[PDB]
Design a protein around this ligand. Sequence first.
Ligand SMILES: CCc1nc(N)nc(N)c1-c1ccc2c(c1)N(CCCOC)C(=O)[C@H](c1cc(F)cc(F)c1)O2
Ligand SMILES: *[C@@H]1O[C@H](CO)[C@@H](O)[C@H](O)[C@H]1NC(C)=O
Length: 333
Amino acid sequence: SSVILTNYMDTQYYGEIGIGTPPQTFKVVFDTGSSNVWVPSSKCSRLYTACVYHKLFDASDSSSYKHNGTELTLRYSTGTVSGFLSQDIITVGGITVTQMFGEVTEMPALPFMLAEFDGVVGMGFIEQAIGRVTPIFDNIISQGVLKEDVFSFYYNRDSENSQSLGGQIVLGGSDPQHYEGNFHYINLIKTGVWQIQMKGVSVGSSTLLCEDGCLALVDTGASYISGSTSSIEKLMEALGAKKRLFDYVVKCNEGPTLPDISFHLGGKEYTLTSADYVFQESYSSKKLCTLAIHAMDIPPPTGPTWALGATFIRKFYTEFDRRNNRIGFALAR
Ligand SMILES: CCc1nc(N)nc(N)c1-c1ccc2c(c1)N(CCCOC)C(=O)[C@H](c1cc(F)cc(F)c1)O2
Ligand SMILES: *[C@@H]1O[C@H](CO)[C@@H](O)[C@H](O)[C@H]1NC(C)=O
């Protein structure tokens, strides 16, 4: 099964899912970086403006709902959400599964007022599930209908017209229509996390970063490519970028010529061009242009680790293989 994804300014990718009977629709990001499913709740106080601006799941309107009520808190690198558990049927591109998800009742304006999506569908392993709730993909796998125990991601580049698909996630396989060449796989460091070993990161013609090795989380729920503060500071000094409150900028006229940045994964260099990582909104030398690379200190056990988000996936179609605990990359088409 495949789900069409909408691309919002190259930083948000989301698709639709149905919850309840009748189906209540929600826009959600498919996140390999988390393992729980949650959408805003009708029980969310309207004092939380984010709740006034998003679709709210209402249990009293679903005849398939199953109460539970266990409280859970979800902590992402850029924001938190709190609520309780509930069960109901979820529709995901033609597949129906009874799933336990969180109904959020606490949704901070910052950053959720800036969220185009309503909730999140974690594609991570149960080992990372909060409240030890069974992840949606596991439940789907339990049906034994998927041709393969894998799922793929395609994140297109932004488009100023309602015609190109923002992205596409395939449940049970990969779509040849959106990648060329062959997949190159890299084994996971350990099942339970979509994290692989990275041999080195190079900026220009010199592997000046991650020598001796480092970690890489392949996170479909992250807008950018992130590294530890130390690493980024160093990488950014190389590009000649200035650090601001939340991002790094470079003079727009300089963007087009910034050097290539490469990531050594499983014996194969994945190269990004300046076009691939800077939001070239202008050419003026009087305007600042943001880079799709940020600094993010992920705490243990997962971190310290780099994170390969949408910036990296836009260029490399990505397949997540559960049966073989490996990740595959192929040039996106
Ligand atoms: C999908 C959940 C999620 N998963 C992981 N693994 N990491 C995250 N940081 C987030 C996460 C949390 C809140 C967010 C966003 C991501 N995203 C990125 C969506 C990525 O889609 C592929 C936003 O758009 C945003 C948001 C808006 C801002 F303006 C500033 C922010 F910091 C955060 O609100
Ligand atoms: C909520 O779900 C968990 C996990 O399935 C279950 O063990 C627990 O009994 C449920 N709680 C209630 C009160 O429904």
